[PDB]
Structure formats: structure tokens, C-alpha cells
């Protein structure tokens, strides 16, 4: 067994962290007081769930998580929420005033004065791991903390934890659920300094999460709660292989091996189905072929884009519920004949499949309905580069006039770092086009 330390940075990271650990405890049968009746080894053991939880002599199962926020308001809910008993104070680190949506402020100005404290708290969790695998970092692109402090934390983790893998769960900026205007600057800034420090990163576009909530759940105007509960279903499906008995994606290293042949192209697209409204009368349970067939519809992708006009480098199919290998192959055959799945010529045209019999657990009273079988597809598509083009374009509209640039230079950043980060994205977009287009 080997441990996995989760790090949540900024508001979006902290709240999404709540939606996940809330779900993890419901899946592993852990109560808010941290007790687990099904665990027979008291205060010890190297089970599969022990990769995300530690155990005390009193039988408490404590997450391997560190919540960092430059403002205490969002973390303070955690100190008093329903799962307050799970964590201890050392795990929750809060500053006094945030980063004002300013990458420079989170990276340089404020970040310098709290980075050694985080590392010390993170080091305190590493000293409990008998074989640390790496870190999962949850954060937003647009936040000044999510972007500015994350990229600094990654630069240091790569120093203090060289051979350890680092996965990201990033939130792509969407205008519908954000009042910030400089999120393009922050996103492109953090992607530049973070690129060489992350082995694999899953991007979620709030625009995608938003319309899934309005379209499938009939939430006219979703809240952050509705968005996070859904986002944790996807995150639970991706991390499940690490928390349950299995053979596919058994440790963080297997994520880069199975999903990223080329280093800089480590942004897999994620697709999920089915998402059914709990307020619904009663839905006809979908077959293994109908849910699998949905993984190739733009509607339920974590980032709106057209995979038809890209090229796949890898592909995983994670199933949960009543599913067997016989049904998976049958569905796949029917799709290759109808769809347009263009693989790159230097990668095998195949799919790795992982089935977990326990169906997706749902938060009581949540928006999602209980299903008997669900799947989440991870696919490395050049089509996701569309997201970069969108964001790079917005960046270019503001930088041409140098709008808002002074807020960053005023916190110690050099104006050159902009064009430096932008030239990097330009090369990133180029690498994508070199791999997909003819």
C-alpha cells in the first residue's frame, strides 16, 4: 500500500475538497465522527482506503488532506461543518486577506510568507506515509490563490518531493459562474509556471458543469453546491481505483503511463454518464451500451469541445455498478462502426477498462439519482486544445492594451513574465496541432 496526500488550494479547491471527502466517507462507510464500523483493523492496517485515510488509536479515520486558503472565510465553514470532526487544526491553514484575484499576489507577495508553513504541514503528513505516492492538488485557474499560490507550491513540492507524482484537478474559468475579469491572465500565468511540475491534470470547465446542471438536473440557476456535488462524482470515479481493490490505475504513476505518452500534453478530457435528476419520477435504467455510447456526446464532457476533429492518444473506461467485461466489448464494437475515433498513428488503437462492482454512491438529499451502472471515460484528445485557444484569445484581447497589467507589476511581477507565459501557451497550442492535424 502507498499513500496519497490531497491538497486543496483557494476557495474552489477547498469547497470541491468538501464535496469529495463528503463523498469518500459515504462510499467507504465513514461517519462524520471519523468512525468506520466495517474496518476490522483498529488504528492500523494497509487496506486500499488507507491510501486516502490514516487511523488513530481511537479508531478515527482522518483524511490525508491539507486545505490552504489565503482568506479564512471559506475554510472556516470546514472548521464548523458537518465533517468538522474529521480533520484536525494543523490540516487547515488560513491567511488573513486573500489575493484579490491576482496571480502576482498569490505567487509572490502573499505566497512567499506562507509557503514554508504549508510545506511544514505537508511534511507532517509525509512523515506518516510508509510509501508516499504523490499529491492531488485541487484548485481554480481564475482565483488569485488557486492560480498564484498553487504554481509556487508545485515548484517547491518538485523540490522537497522529487520522485513523487503530482496530479491536478483544475477549474477552467467560466463567465456564467464568476465575477472576475482577469481570470484569463491568472489561468495562463499558472499554466506556464506549473506545466513542467505536473504529471497529469484534469480540467473541468464550469461552463460544462453548469449546463449539465441546468440540462440534466433542471436546476435553473445552479449554486456552487450543485456544481461541486457533481464534480466530486467525477473525481470519485477517477480516484476510485486508488481507494478500492483493483488492478487498473493502482498508483499515481499508472496515470501518466496510461494517459500521457508526451509530457506537455497531460490534460485528459473527462466524460461522465449517466446524470439523472433525483427529483425525477423514475428513469429507465440505461444499459452498458447506452451509457458507454454517451461518452462520445459533447453534452456530458467536462470541457465542451469536438473530439471528432482531434486525435486520441489514450483511452480509459472506468465503470461502477452492475457491469461485466462481456457487455463492455459489445458496446465498444457498436461505437467504432458509427463514430469517428481517429487515433494518432504512433499509439495503439485500444481502450483500458476498469470495472468496480459497487455502483456510484449518492449524497443523501443531493441532486443526483441512484443508478445501477455508471462510467467515466478518460481520453487524451487533441480536441481539448480548443479550450486553450479560447483562453489564449481572451488573454490576447486584454494584453494588446495592457489592461490590468499594472495590478500584477505592482505586486513585484515583471511584465515580461506575461509574454513569456503567453509564448509558452503558443508553443503548447502548437504541440497539440502537430499531433492531430494533417
Amino acid at each position: 500500500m502507498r499513500e496519497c496526500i490531497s491538497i486543496h488550494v483557494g476557495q474552489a479547491g477547498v469547497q470541491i475538497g468538501n464535496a469529495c471527502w463528503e463523498l469518500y466517507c459515504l462510499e467507504h462507510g465513514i461517519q462524520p465522527d471519523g468512525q468506520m464500523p466495517s474496518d476490522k483493523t483498529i488504528g492500523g492496517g494497509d487496506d486500499s482506503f488507507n491510501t486516502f485515510f490514516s487511523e488513530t488509536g481511537a479508531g478515527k479515520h482522518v483524511p490525508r488532506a491539507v486545505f490552504v486558503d489565503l482568506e479564512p472565510t471559506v475554510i472556516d465553514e470546514v472548521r464548523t461543518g458537518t465533517y468538522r470532526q474529521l480533520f484536525h487544526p494543523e490540516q487547515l491553514i488560513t491567511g488573513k486577506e486573500d489575493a484579490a484575484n491576482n496571480y502576482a499576489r498569490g505567487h509572490y507577495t502573499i505566497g512567499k510568507e506562507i509557503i514554508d508553513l504549508v510545506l511544514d504541514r505537508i511534511r507532517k503528513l509525509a512523515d506518516q506515509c510508509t510509501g508516499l505516492q504523490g499529491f492531488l492538488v485541487f484548485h481554480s485557474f481564475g482565483g488569485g490563490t488557486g492560480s498564484g499560490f498553487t504554481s509556487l507550491l508545485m515548484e517547491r513540492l518538485s523540490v522537497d518531493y522529487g520522485k513523487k507524482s503530482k496530479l491536478e484537478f483544475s477549474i477552467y474559468p467560466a463567465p456564467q459562474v464568476s465575477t472576475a475579469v482577469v481570470e484569463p491572465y491568472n489561468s495562463i500565468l499558472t499554466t506556464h509556471t506549473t506545466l513542467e511540475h505536473s504529471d497529469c491534470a484534469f480540467m473541468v470547465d464550469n461552463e460544462a458543469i453548469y449546463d449539465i446542471c441546468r440540462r440534466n438536473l433542471d436546476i435553473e440557476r445552479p449554486t456552487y453546491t450543485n456544481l461541486n456535488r457533481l464534480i466530486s462524482q467525477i473525481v470519485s470515479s477517477i480516484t476510485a481505483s486508488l481507494r478500492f481493490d483493483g488492478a487498473l490505475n493502482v498508483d499515481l504513476t499508472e496515470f501518466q503511463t496510461n494517459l500521457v505518452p508526451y509530457p506537455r500534453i497531460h490534460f485528459p478530457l473527462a466524460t461522465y454518464a449517466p446524470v439523472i435528476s433525483a427529483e425525477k419520477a423514475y428513469h429507465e435504467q440505461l444499459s452498458v451500451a447506452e451509457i458507454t455510447n454517451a461518452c462520445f456526446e459533447p453534452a456530458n464532457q467536462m470541457v465542451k469541445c469536438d473530439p471528432r476533429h482531434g486525435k486520441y492518444m489514450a483511452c480509459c473506461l472506468l465503470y461502477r455498478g452492475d457491469v461485466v467485461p462481456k457487455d463492455v466489448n459489445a458496446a465498444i464494437a457498436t461505437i467504432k462502426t458509427k463514430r469517428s475515433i481517429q487515433f494518432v498513428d504512433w499509439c495503439p488503437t485500444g481502450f483500458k477498462v476498469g470495472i468496480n462492482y459497487q455502483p456510484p454512491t449518492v449524497v443523501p438529499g443531493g441532486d443526483l439519482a441512484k443508478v445501477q451502472r455508471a462510467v467515466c471515460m478518460l481520453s487524451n484528445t487533441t480536441a481539448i486544445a480548443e479550450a486553450w485557444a479560447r483562453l489564449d484569445h481572451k488573454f490576447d484581447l486584454m494584453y494588446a492594451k495592457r489592461a490590468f497589467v499594472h495590478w500584477y507589476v505592482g505586486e513585484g511581477m515583471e511584465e515580461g513574465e506575461f509574454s513569456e507565459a503567453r509564448e509558452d501557451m503558443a508553443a503548447l497550442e502548437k504541440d497539440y496541432e502537430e499531433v492531430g492535424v494533417d
Binding site: 509572490y108 467485461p325 463492455v328 488503437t349 459497487q358 515583471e414
Partner: protein, 54 residues
């Protein structure tokens, strides 16, 4: 349409299907970048205090 490496346990199983075959900054340089920016904030605030002194 082949199914290789089929692993079955109690809580599920995992396999692979092939359809077609194919055809950092040191701790010294990060403190310099940080301090280099803290130095540019000091210089800027000086020109503001010098301005206010005048």
C-alpha cells in the same frame, strides 16, 4: 478485438482491449525569484515615499 491482462478480484475486474496496432528550478533560484520581486516592491514603494516627501 482482443482482451489481454484480465484481472478479476472481489470488487470488480480490469482488462485491456486492442482494436488496432500502432503505425526544474532549485531551492536557490526560487528564493531569488521571490526576493527579486520583493525587491521590486521595495523600490516602487520608495519612489512613492520619495514622491510624498517632495
Amino acid at each position: 478485438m482482443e482482451v489481454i491482462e484480465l484481472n478479476k478480484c472481489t470488487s470488480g475486474q480490469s482488462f485491456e482491449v486492442i482494436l488496432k496496432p500502432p503505425s526544474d528550478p532549485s531551492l536557490e533560484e526560487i528564493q531569488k525569484k521571490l526576493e527579486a520581486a520583493e525587491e521590486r516592491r521595495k523600490y516602487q514603494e520608495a519612489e512613492l515615499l520619495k514622491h510624498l516627501a517632495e
